[PDB]
Amino acid sequence: GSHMRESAEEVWGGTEDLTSLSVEELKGLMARFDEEEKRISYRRRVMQGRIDVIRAEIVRRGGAVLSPEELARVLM
Amino acid sequence: GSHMRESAEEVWGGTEDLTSLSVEELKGLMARFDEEEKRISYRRRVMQGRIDVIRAEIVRRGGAVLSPEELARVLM
Ligand SMILES: [Mg+2]
């Protein structure tokens, strides 16, 4: 447990003016948000790869269940 | 096989060959993965904006607590 120590999200949401934070505090915020950005980017790459494989497999079947634009825009 | 109530992640991990799935099953997978990719892309945009604001605020101070490369790579 955190023992009520503030999370990066809570510090960020509760700060009216960043000028009131120290550089050490700002660097902690930036580090936390940067880590989340990197985790998201890794997961986006996984999702894009799976979508690419699925879309190629649907196209491979040479059917007409879905139109070209439904495939391109993922209108399912 | 039928009415197994599997999640998209479970279907994906448990399918050795996508030719075993119906087009309707592939549609559902594509839709779930596309929705997830859009959801975390939105969150990524938020994280990138917060990082941009924090980095500008540290630069604004005109100090030397952090080097240029430390700021550029978020090394903390
Ligand atoms: Mg900037």
One-character DSSP codes across A7-29: PHHHHHHH-S-GGGS-HHHHHHH
Q: What is the resolution of this structure in A?
A: 1.9
The SS3 assignment for A34 reads: helix
Interchain pair B65, A12: CB under 8 A: no
Judge whether B38 is annotated as a binding position.
Answer: yes
Q: How far apart are the first and last CA of chain B?
A: 50
A42: left (phi over 0), alpha (psi -120 to 50) or beta: alpha
Whether residue B74 lies within 8 A of chain A, CB to CB, comes out as: yes
Roughly what angle, to the nearest 10 degrees, separates helices B23-60 and A23-60?
160
